[PDB]
Scaffold this active site. Structure first.
Site, PDB file in Angstrom:
ATOM      1  N   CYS A  42      38.698  46.745  16.358  1.00 44.84           N
ATOM      2  CA  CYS A  42      39.094  45.345  16.255  1.00 44.84           C
ATOM      3  C   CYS A  42      39.765  45.060  14.919  1.00 44.84           C
ATOM      4  O   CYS A  42      39.107  45.077  13.877  1.00 44.84           O
ATOM      5  CB  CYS A  42      37.875  44.435  16.416  1.00 44.84           C
ATOM      6  SG  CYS A  42      38.366  42.694  16.421  1.00 44.84           S
ATOM      7  N   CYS A  45      38.349  41.965  13.089  1.00 45.63           N
ATOM      8  CA  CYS A  45      37.008  42.266  12.578  1.00 45.63           C
ATOM      9  C   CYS A  45      37.125  43.045  11.289  1.00 45.63           C
ATOM     10  O   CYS A  45      36.463  42.738  10.296  1.00 45.63           O
ATOM     11  CB  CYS A  45      36.191  43.086  13.592  1.00 45.63           C
ATOM     12  SG  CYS A  45      35.771  42.204  15.089  1.00 45.63           S
TER      13      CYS A  45
END
Length: 121
Positions: A42, A45
């Site tokens: 991600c 993230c």
């Protein structure tokens, strides 16, 4: 050294099972608990992680649980997590008190959630 371990302080814990997750919430007592649902790949993230780690250093008494979605799919599904990054907050007898997505650009949303539920708020 995986990106989610870099500069992660002592109040940041990796969660690898439902049993561990539930034990963590129980053992937290009345501490504010921030659960960071992230993905290995991600980008958002990964980009927001250094700021999350700084926030953890800024709040030593908040417990941060890191839950890798890709390695905990059934647990994340049972927690209704559908998108990453995602956050739950838990606090004592109130149980879950926040549920929201975030990113580096809108990181202030996470701080606003701390304003709402921190010890002494």
């Amino acid at each position: 050294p995986k990106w989610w371990e870099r500069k992660a302080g002592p109040n940041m814990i990796d969660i690898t099972s439902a049993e561990q997750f539930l034990n963590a919430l129980k053992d937290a007592g009345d501490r504010l608990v921030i659960v960071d649902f992230y993905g290995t790949w991600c980008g958002s993230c990964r980009a927001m992680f250094p700021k999350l780690c700084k926030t953890a250093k800024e709040h030593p008494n908040i417990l941060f649980l890191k839950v890798n979605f890709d390695e905990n799919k059934s647990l994340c599904k049972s927690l209704n997590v559908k998108v990453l990054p995602y956050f739950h907050f838990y606090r004592g007898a109130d149980g879950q008190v926040e549920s929201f997505s975030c990113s580096l650009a809108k990181f202030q949303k996470l701080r606003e959630a701390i304003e709402r539920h921190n010890v002494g708020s």
